[PDB]
Amino acid sequence: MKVDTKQIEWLLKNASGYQISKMSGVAQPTISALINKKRSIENLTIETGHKLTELANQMQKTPLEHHH
Amino acid sequence: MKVDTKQIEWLLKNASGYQISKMSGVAQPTISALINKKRSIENLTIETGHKLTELANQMQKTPLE
Amino acid sequence: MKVDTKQIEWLLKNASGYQISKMSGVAQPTISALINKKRSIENLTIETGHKLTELANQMQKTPL
Amino acid sequence: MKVDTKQIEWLLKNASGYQISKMSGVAQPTISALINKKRSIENLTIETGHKLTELANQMQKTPLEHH
């Protein structure tokens, strides 16, 4: 598994907490605490960090029409 | 410089030769040849492949609607 | 930070808990737990995984 | 295929041309031109760059004692 915290930050600014939790499988309280900056990315498990990196990768690869 | 051919493929599938050339600086005949498969991605130089990889990364990281 | 669990597995393969701990600052009991398969790599924090992914990168890039 | 020019540079400092060439399939003249700067790494093909990046990864992953 690979994790990239820059991808996780991109994710946290580019989708809603509901969509991140539903599309990544990560629990709603973890995603809300990340968005509120009540808990740090650095202290997540590698497993969580991988799920959020993968979702970020997939969403970034949506066609250019759905960007900007 | 880093190159990733998967990113170049994504680029060629998601943007026109005109837009790729205008945003990457690679001459449009090179891009047109890649899109029509008269030239292969694997035979590009590392320098060009890096330019196309950076453009793809940049487009992918543009904020979502 | 970046993590690659493959790099971490290579490190646990190629260095002892004492040396990993001593060069990365990760607690030697955490490393031992990884080496006896009491804890998963996936359950380390991202920060710890980043430190171990780096140690592995550094050792791999030492000459020769 | 992925290319990393630092991995290529590392390889050129850490192994001889004879068998960078011999393990990667790239012709020794290309490797010699790289070693003697005649030619830049950035002008290699992606295909060549991938073979050299791959070899560099493989050689770097050899155990501690061989470093």
Outline:
4 copies of one chain form a homotetramer. The first copy, chain A, is 62% helix and 4% strand.
Report the strand count of chain A.
Answer: 1
Instruction: Label the CATH architecture of chain A.
Output: Orthogonal Bundle
- The tally of helices of chain A reads 4
Supply the helix-strand structural class of chain A.
mainly alpha
Structurally, the number of domains of chain A stands at 1
| CATH C-level of chain A | Mainly Alpha
Radius of gyration of chain A: 11 Å
Largest pleated sheet of chain A = none
The CATH topology of chain A is: 434 Repressor (Amino-terminal Domain)
Overall helicity of chain A:
55-70%
Distance N to C terminus of chain A = 29 Å
Oligomer designation: homotetramer
Strand content of chain A: under 5%
Order of helices and strands of chain A: EHHHH
Shape of chain A: globular
Chain pair with largest interface: A-C, 14 and 15 residues
